Amino acid sequence: GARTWRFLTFGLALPSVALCTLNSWLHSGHRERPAFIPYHHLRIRTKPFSWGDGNHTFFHNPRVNPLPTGYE
Amino acid sequence: ALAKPQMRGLLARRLRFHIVGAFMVSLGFATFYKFAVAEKRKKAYADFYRNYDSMKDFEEMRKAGIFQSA
Amino acid sequence: FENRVAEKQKLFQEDNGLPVHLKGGATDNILYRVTMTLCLGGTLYSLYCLGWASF
Amino acid sequence: MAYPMQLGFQDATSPIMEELLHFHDHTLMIVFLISSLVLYIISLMLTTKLTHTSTMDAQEVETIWTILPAIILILIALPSLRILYMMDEINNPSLTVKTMGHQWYWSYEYTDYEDLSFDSYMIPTSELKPGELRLLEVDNRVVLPMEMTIRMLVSSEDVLHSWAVPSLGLKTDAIPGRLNQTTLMSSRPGLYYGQCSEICGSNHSFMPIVLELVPLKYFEKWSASML
Amino acid sequence: MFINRWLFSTNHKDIGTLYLLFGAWAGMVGTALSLLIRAELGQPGTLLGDDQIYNVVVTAHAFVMIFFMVMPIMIGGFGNWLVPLMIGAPDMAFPRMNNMSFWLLPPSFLLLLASSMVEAGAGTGWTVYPPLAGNLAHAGASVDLTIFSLHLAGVSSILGAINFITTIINMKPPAMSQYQTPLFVWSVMITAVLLLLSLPVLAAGITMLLTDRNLNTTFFDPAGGGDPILYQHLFWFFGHPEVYILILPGFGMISHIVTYYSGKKEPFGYMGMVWAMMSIGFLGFIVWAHHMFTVGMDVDTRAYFTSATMIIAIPTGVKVFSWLATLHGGNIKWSPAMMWALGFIFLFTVGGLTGIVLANSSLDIVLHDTYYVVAHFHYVLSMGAVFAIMGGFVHWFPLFSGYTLNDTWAKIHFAIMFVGVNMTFFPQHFLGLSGMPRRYSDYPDAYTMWNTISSMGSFISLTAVMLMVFIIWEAFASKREVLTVDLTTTNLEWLNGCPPPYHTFEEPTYVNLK
Amino acid sequence: APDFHDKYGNAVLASGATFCVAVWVYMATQIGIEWNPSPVGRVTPKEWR
Amino acid sequence: QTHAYHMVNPSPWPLTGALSALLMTSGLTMWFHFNSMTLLMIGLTTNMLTMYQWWRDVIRESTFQGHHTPAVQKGLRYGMILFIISEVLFFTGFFWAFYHSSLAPTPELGGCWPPTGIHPLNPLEVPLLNTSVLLASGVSITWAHHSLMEGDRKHMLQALFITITLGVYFTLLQASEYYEAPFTISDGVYGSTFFVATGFHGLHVIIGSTFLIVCFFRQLKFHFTSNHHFGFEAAAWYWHFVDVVWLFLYVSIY
Amino acid sequence: TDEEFDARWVTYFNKPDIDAWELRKGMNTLVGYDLVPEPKIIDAALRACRRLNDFASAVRILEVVKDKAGPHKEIYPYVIQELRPTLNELGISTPEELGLDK
Amino acid sequence: YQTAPFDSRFPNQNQTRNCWQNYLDFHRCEKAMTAKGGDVSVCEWYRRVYKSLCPISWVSTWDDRRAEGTFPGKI
Amino acid sequence: YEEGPGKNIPFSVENKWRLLAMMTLFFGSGFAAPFFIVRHQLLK
Amino acid sequence: YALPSYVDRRDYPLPDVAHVKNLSASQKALKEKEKASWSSLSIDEKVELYRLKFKESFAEMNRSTNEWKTVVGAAMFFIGFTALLLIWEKHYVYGPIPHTFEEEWVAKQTKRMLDMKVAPIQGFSAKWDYDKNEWK
Amino acid sequence: ITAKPAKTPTSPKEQAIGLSVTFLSFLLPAGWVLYHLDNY
Amino acid sequence: GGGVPTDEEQATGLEREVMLAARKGQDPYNILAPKATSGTKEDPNLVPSITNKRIVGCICEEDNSTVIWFWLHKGEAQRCPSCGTHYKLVP
Ligand code: HEA
Ligand code: HEA
Ligand SMILES: CCCCCCCCCCOCCO[C@H]1O[C@H](CO)[C@@H](O)[C@H](O)[C@@H]1O
Ligand SMILES: CCCCCCCCCCOCCO[C@H]1O[C@H](CO)[C@@H](O)[C@H](O)[C@@H]1O
Ligand SMILES: CCCCCCCCCCOCCO[C@H]1O[C@H](CO)[C@@H](O)[C@H](O)[C@@H]1O
Ligand code: CUA
Ligand SMILES: [O-][O-]
Ligand SMILES: [Cu+2]
Ligand SMILES: [Mg+2]
Ligand code: NA
Ligand code: NA
Ligand SMILES: [Zn+2]
């Protein structure tokens, strides 16, 4: 019944989400900017993107995403 | 007085005989291909190579001017 | 909130010969017109872009 | 090469293509067996005033209509798979040659010892010497030793191509980033022609392959002279 | 009333009629393209220009004939018209969604036309393989427009597949089991299952191609660790089932036509015909890599695909033998539709058998990417799918229109087409065996005689197509209204007259369970 | 009561056949189509080098 | 009529939907090649309008007009199942792409997986939270379904609200994960397979959350009965599909 | 067996109050089989026609006997010979005698 | 040395990995030998095999990348 | 809606010559389209 | 369209309705007479009874036709017409073929093909006699 | 199938016109373009 | 808590007609297959209709795949043209 699934929702499901939330917020912060190496299989540009200046990914994050020529 | 002929199963009887014939004709036709074409081809390759001299074949080609390398 | 389904059943079952997409009333006709006008006008614009792009 | 009004395969130049000619004859005989059976039976069904239109019992034929075709498929698959596996058996070649596909020409590399390579373009029709073959001749042929097992490795530097030589039973796709192998063995000297066999753009029709098969001595001589 | 009727339809018959008109218009475009191919090849040399314009034409030919002529006519046209009638249903399950499956096709066709009008067109082959179809070797909009064309046609067919499967499973009379539905209904259901499973995989693959072209993905690009061969697997995972989708409804119509013109109440071996179509549908998903025997796959893989592909001959043979056994003992009526069906049985067999030749990977080395493949597939398409279309169209035109055709004209049409298609394609076997590659705008001089003859056959086929237009006009011009149709007791689609009223089976059939 | 085919059949058949043959032979032989037939038994080889 | 099926009123929505498809696709083409988004925006707008009116009409036909007899309902069940099956096979293609690349890494990658230079997300960090979030939403929607069947308005609404909140949470978490990731869609086939597969899945989360929201508003307006609520069942089946796809992604692609 | 099949069909046509629907159903069923019906079946069918006052159907029944024989030209003359007493007694003319074979 | 022998690790039509592995082994072998004052000329077997098998442009591109610090193979 | 022969179609068959004109525009436009695109392209 | 109807079909010899539904004066009289001995009916009366029930006889419904002549002849006309299109194409669409089709080029090319022994086992050079320097 | 006589019989002349117009609708536009290829 | 309407309370139009007729063991919208009688002339299958004719399909023998279809008219009972079972229209 509904009572069982409500029990599961408040006893198992939401507490699990709460613990994972707590653990992600605590252990978030900001870690290492990876050192840049201009590997030819990464930062692929075969055609400019259709937004921005053509060279920035859609969720480009200046802190951790280098351009083909390196970090900004 | 006319004698009683067979009146039942005439289509089935025609098929029983003609199916055997279909198989014979179709096997004959396929086997004729095998004979006229495949057996002829086996013999033509075995005969061509039986005493084939690759170097003589080469020299003749060379002499006629066909090669870049010789 | 209150259950007003009975009112909506009476409205949508009114014997006025309207097809279902217009049976809500005047607001339906407006939303229909806007929809069809954007579709047809946009289709015209798309043929325009093709003409331009073809050369 | 092909000749006018030709009906079947180009004559075999390699043992493997000989096998394929026989296997094709064997399979085409079966094609003729079945297609003649069907036309004969069609014709039989359509040539009688006798009738039987009530329901017919279908279970009587269940067996022969599936078992005899199964047996015929076996008769095809057995030699088919024998040839498949024979062709795959361990190759010990004496020579490795690479070819790279390009828009629209082939390059060849013979790098077992020396770094020999060159490009091979189609001879334009306006530049053919008397008696030379329209769309087939190249400037620099692929010179190879006859009567030797040769490993040909095939790739591309741009789009797909496919490296084919019908008379030797060869067709290997030229895929950028991949190195595909085939083996080649000619029973005879001569000139053996193929054509690009994957759609590759403007001049797909116009980037042929010419193998020139000669005794080892002349291959070595040519090798050294093309360095 | 015209806009309401023909643009806002929720009626299975009118939607069927729209599909038949669309498909007949597409067939003219595809015939023009076929003539352009054969005009280029009809004498040695260059007629139109280089391989780019030529393969734009070849690629468009294929897309038009497959996605805009065959599929809309068989599934949209005959499926919509006949399926509801054959199970006594009042319409399709989703009669409004059905109209969108129709209306997606003119825009899909407009996209393809746009692809050929911009830049230098999409000269890729209907397979659209990268890297030729990528953004460096086909820079610009053409390939993208082609992809979008396929997405729309894909959505149209997916939605249509959901509609047909739901209709066929849910809307029969309550006493009727699935094994008391006619064979065309089965063929449509099975085709719909194949579409439902296969088109989403195509959609994924062409979406990857779109992202490689525009979002800097590298699914198919070695530089990023991608692989052009991946695209081939995804394409042919769809593409093999696609050819079964093209032929299955034609199998269904052939069973009906053969039965009817043999004077029979039922096809021979109904259960075997159902089993055979289900077997073919299943086997059609486990054979795709016979399109890839020269790409460099492992030997055991090549053995498996050779073997599995040949197995398809067994259930297919059951259907051929069952059609012959339907003829057996018939009161044979040599109608034009009967002629199409007999030509189908024989010529489809020939095409099937050259497919069995090609199933052999070792031999396929030498046949792959030659005209032998082109000969195989045109026997099963131009002399198979198309013969079933023509048969069905002549047979059911009186049901759909209420008018009869001139049977003598229809027989003349058949005879000319028969000569034309055989003259076009039979010599292509020789061109293939002797080494003529696919997708070539010109050929070495040796290949001239067979190319010449082949082109001459294409012109005869043109004459047949032109004549068919005239024959349809003459029927509508003369207005011979149908009077009696025989064998209605086992052909339910006819029982509401010619044409049937807009609404049929408002009162459903009475069938008891006993 | 004789039908279309009783009246016009033999005429359509004879004329059609005659027209078809005449026009195809003319097309094949009189307008410069190069069929490129086999050289075998037809062409005399000539020096090329 | 003396059958139980639904003869639908003639409708413009099929045509507007088909034209919306034309405008979205020609609009993407104009965006990718001619640097303009106008056509695309008009297509998205007409697509949204068509979806709104078409599904509005299905509610009119069912809740308000009574056309969903058991036989019509049974057909909608089949149609939703079949639609889901087609979506599963769409995703299968991306799984195939992922395995093709990852099980045979090419020399350009360093001949290894993950590729040289790629730092994968740790699946025991935000992706585990994502997993808990969608699993919990599968539990809540099940509570919502049982509450509906038992006739319990308040608990249905509460359960359904929780389910939607969780889908929105997933979407926000995934947007953040996308922003924080040190690799991009342009980081070769690693980036391609990861973002396109998870991206289509995120699209489906959005779609399913939207469908649940429609259900929420319909439940607020008393449309559903304790025995007749197929829009809700269809949204729950779609949501379970969204959950199962995530679980495969989690296990496979991370 | 053949004899049991024959006797059922004779019995069918012999039903004194056989109606017109039943006579037609009988004959139309029978001609679907791979056989020319035995004289005693046709005899019984002809006499049903007489009880049903249907001369035309009697003629038609003789035509369908000839038709079912196909290229086996000895079967019709034979059945006619065997039927002559019934033909004479009921005044049933053959299709040939009526010119209906031209 | 005439050409690269059959290698049972690479028995298939796709020879990509055979070229790759031998290019890697040449450089791995040189590093390990030179580190232990060992005989570096032993590694010549690998150089001969990769030179036979690998396209010139692949060897050239990988060489360039090693010089650049962007070669993705582990050596 | 109109029912019966000539009435269940989106085109009129009232007059056979107007029908001929409509059928000819219909089919002839589809046949002609590829030729006109070839023209279009060669003129670039 | 929903009513039982008439057909002439040799496997349905007794159709669902008579050929003539509505009978004149004398036709009803003839039907009444059919109730008495049939020996008392004339040949004409018997034929008339037959033609009230049935439309065509077996012989008539099974007749041969000359349609095959019209079909074959007309097909051949249309096939002939096609050759006119080909002639038109040859004159107005096609330009010159390549120079490699000139007779001298072919003579040269043929010699070179024999010198390289093109298809020497069966297909081409096999048909040339190298000893006698002629075609076999 | 059986049918009523033609409501609006199409005489041989009328068929010759219909056939000619049909064939010309295909042949003239294509022929025009094919003739003029060189000019393009 | 309650608050969710029932079908009894809120079902409408044809859904409601079907539900109400089912409670009374009636099938005006043909959801169920009609049970056969012995099908003799004395005991024909009674075929309801809202007009003066309805199509019958007769599955003559169970697991026949072929169904025999015909128009049943108002008036004298008619017979399946394959098995002869009797049907009578009740308009
Ligand atoms: C259904 C599919 C189909 C059909 C019918 C055809 C029909 C024809 N095709 Fe084919 N063709 C393909 C699909 C088809 N083709 C595909 C898939 C390819 C490969 C593409 C690639 O390589 O990428 C191809 C490639 C191809 C080539 C090879 C190009 C190359 O490799 O360079 C050639 C060459 O002659 C050719 C010619 C023709 C000709 C002369 C016809 C003629 O037989 C056409 C004649 C006309 C008809 C058969 C009737 C048309 C139908 C109607 C008018 C509808 C009528 C409507 C109603 C009754 C409702 N086609
Ligand atoms: C309607 C379309 C259709 C159909 C139904 C088929 C059916 C079959 N096809 Fe074909 N095919 C195509 C259309 C179709 N094909 C196209 C379009 C391509 C090219 C794609 C491209 O590259 O563009 C192609 C390519 C193609 C290839 C790839 C070749 C290459 O590219 O190198 C192969 C290889 O196995 C193949 C095989 C078969 C087989 C075995 C069948 C079987 O289903 C045939 C089974 C039928 C029979 C065998 C006949 C009936 C049987 C009997 C009478 C019983 C007895 C028979 C035996 C015992 C043998 N087809
Ligand atoms: C079939 C229909 C598919 C619909 C596709 C919709 C895609 C809409 C994308 C809109 O993207 C706009 C560009 O946004 C990108 O570039 C902008 C700078 O130019 C940034 O401000 C944004 O943050 C983002 O990185
Ligand atoms: C719906 C399908 C419609 C199909 C229409 C097909 C007609 C296609 C004509 C395609 O034109 C391609 C462009 O070709 C021209 O430009 C190319 C590139 O510069 C050249 O390589 C060619 O020789 C050609 O001159
Ligand atoms: C479930 C899958 C996730 C999909 C979530 C999509 C909804 C989130 C949309 C947010 O889009 C914006 C990305 O924007 C960020 O980076 C962009 C580029 O540097 C910037 O222009 C923006 O200002 C922003 O900083
Ligand atoms: Cu290179 Cu085709
Ligand atoms: O695909 O055959
Ligand atoms: Cu296939
Ligand atoms: Mg290929
Ligand atoms: Na050409
Ligand atoms: Na429920
Ligand atoms: Zn019955």
CSV table of C-alpha atoms in Angstrom, one decimal, chain G residues 25-141:
chain,number,residue,atom,x,y,z
G,25,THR,CA,15.5,21.5,-38.3
G,26,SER,CA,16.0,24.2,-40.9
G,27,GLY,CA,16.5,26.5,-37.8
G,28,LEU,CA,19.4,24.3,-36.5
G,29,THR,CA,20.8,24.4,-40.0
G,30,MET,CA,20.7,28.2,-40.1
G,31,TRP,CA,22.2,28.3,-36.6
G,32,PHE,CA,25.1,25.9,-37.4
G,33,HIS,CA,25.9,27.5,-40.8
G,34,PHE,CA,24.6,31.0,-41.1
G,35,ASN,CA,25.0,32.0,-37.5
G,36,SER,CA,21.3,32.9,-36.8
G,37,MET,CA,18.8,31.5,-34.2
G,38,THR,CA,15.6,33.1,-35.4
G,39,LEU,CA,14.2,30.3,-37.4
G,40,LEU,CA,15.1,27.8,-34.6
G,41,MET,CA,13.3,30.0,-32.0
G,42,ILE,CA,10.2,30.2,-34.1
G,43,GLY,CA,10.3,26.4,-34.4
G,44,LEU,CA,10.8,25.7,-30.7
G,45,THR,CA,7.9,28.1,-30.1
G,46,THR,CA,5.5,26.4,-32.6
G,47,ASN,CA,6.6,23.0,-31.3
G,48,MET,CA,5.7,24.0,-27.7
G,49,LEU,CA,2.4,25.5,-28.8
G,50,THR,CA,1.5,22.3,-30.7
G,51,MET,CA,2.4,20.0,-27.8
G,52,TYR,CA,0.4,22.2,-25.4
G,53,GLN,CA,-2.8,22.2,-27.5
G,54,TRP,CA,-2.6,18.6,-28.6
G,55,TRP,CA,-2.3,17.3,-25.1
G,56,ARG,CA,-4.8,19.8,-23.9
G,57,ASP,CA,-7.2,18.3,-26.4
G,58,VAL,CA,-6.5,14.7,-25.2
G,59,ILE,CA,-7.4,15.8,-21.7
G,60,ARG,CA,-10.6,17.4,-23.1
G,61,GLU,CA,-11.4,14.2,-24.9
G,62,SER,CA,-10.9,12.0,-21.9
G,63,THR,CA,-11.5,13.8,-18.5
G,64,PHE,CA,-14.1,16.2,-20.0
G,65,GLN,CA,-15.8,14.3,-22.9
G,66,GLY,CA,-15.6,10.6,-21.7
G,67,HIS,CA,-14.1,9.1,-24.9
G,68,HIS,CA,-11.5,7.0,-23.0
G,69,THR,CA,-13.3,3.7,-22.8
G,70,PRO,CA,-11.4,0.6,-21.6
G,71,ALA,CA,-10.6,-0.3,-25.1
G,72,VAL,CA,-9.2,3.2,-25.9
G,73,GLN,CA,-7.2,3.2,-22.7
G,74,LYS,CA,-5.7,-0.2,-23.5
G,75,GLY,CA,-4.5,1.2,-26.8
G,76,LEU,CA,-2.8,4.1,-25.1
G,77,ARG,CA,-1.1,1.6,-22.8
G,78,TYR,CA,0.4,-0.2,-25.9
G,79,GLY,CA,1.3,3.1,-27.5
G,80,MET,CA,3.2,4.4,-24.5
G,81,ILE,CA,5.1,1.0,-24.1
G,82,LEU,CA,6.0,1.0,-27.7
G,83,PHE,CA,7.2,4.7,-27.5
G,84,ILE,CA,9.4,3.8,-24.5
G,85,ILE,CA,10.8,0.8,-26.4
G,86,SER,CA,11.8,3.1,-29.3
G,87,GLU,CA,13.6,5.5,-26.8
G,88,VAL,CA,15.4,2.5,-25.3
G,89,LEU,CA,16.8,1.6,-28.7
G,90,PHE,CA,17.8,5.2,-29.3
G,91,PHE,CA,19.9,5.1,-26.1
G,92,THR,CA,21.3,1.7,-27.1
G,93,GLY,CA,23.1,3.4,-30.0
G,94,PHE,CA,25.0,5.6,-27.6
G,95,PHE,CA,25.9,2.7,-25.3
G,96,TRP,CA,27.2,0.9,-28.4
G,97,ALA,CA,29.3,4.0,-29.3
G,98,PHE,CA,30.6,4.1,-25.8
G,99,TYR,CA,31.7,0.4,-25.7
G,100,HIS,CA,33.1,0.5,-29.2
G,101,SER,CA,35.6,3.4,-28.2
G,102,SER,CA,36.3,2.2,-24.7
G,103,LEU,CA,37.0,-1.5,-25.3
G,104,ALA,CA,39.3,-0.9,-28.2
G,105,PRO,CA,41.1,2.4,-27.5
G,106,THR,CA,43.0,3.7,-30.5
G,107,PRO,CA,46.7,4.9,-30.6
G,108,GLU,CA,45.6,8.6,-30.6
G,109,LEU,CA,44.2,8.0,-27.1
G,110,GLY,CA,47.5,6.3,-26.0
G,111,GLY,CA,45.9,2.9,-26.7
G,112,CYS,CA,44.3,3.0,-23.2
G,113,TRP,CA,41.0,3.8,-21.5
G,114,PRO,CA,40.5,6.3,-20.0
G,115,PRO,CA,42.5,8.2,-22.6
G,116,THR,CA,45.9,9.8,-21.6
G,117,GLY,CA,45.1,13.3,-20.3
G,118,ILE,CA,41.5,12.6,-19.2
G,119,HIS,CA,40.6,12.8,-15.6
G,120,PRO,CA,37.2,11.0,-15.2
G,121,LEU,CA,34.5,12.1,-12.7
G,122,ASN,CA,34.6,9.9,-9.5
G,123,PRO,CA,31.4,7.9,-9.5
G,124,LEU,CA,31.3,7.8,-5.7
G,125,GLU,CA,31.0,11.6,-5.5
G,126,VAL,CA,28.2,13.7,-7.2
G,127,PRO,CA,27.2,10.8,-9.5
G,128,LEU,CA,26.3,8.6,-6.4
G,129,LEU,CA,24.2,11.5,-5.1
G,130,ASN,CA,22.5,11.7,-8.6
G,131,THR,CA,21.8,7.9,-8.3
G,132,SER,CA,20.3,8.3,-4.8
G,133,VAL,CA,18.2,11.1,-6.1
G,134,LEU,CA,16.7,9.2,-9.0
G,135,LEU,CA,16.2,6.0,-7.0
G,136,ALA,CA,14.5,8.0,-4.3
G,137,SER,CA,12.2,9.6,-6.9
G,138,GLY,CA,11.3,6.0,-8.1
G,139,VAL,CA,10.2,5.2,-4.5
G,140,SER,CA,8.2,8.5,-4.1
G,141,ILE,CA,6.4,8.1,-7.4
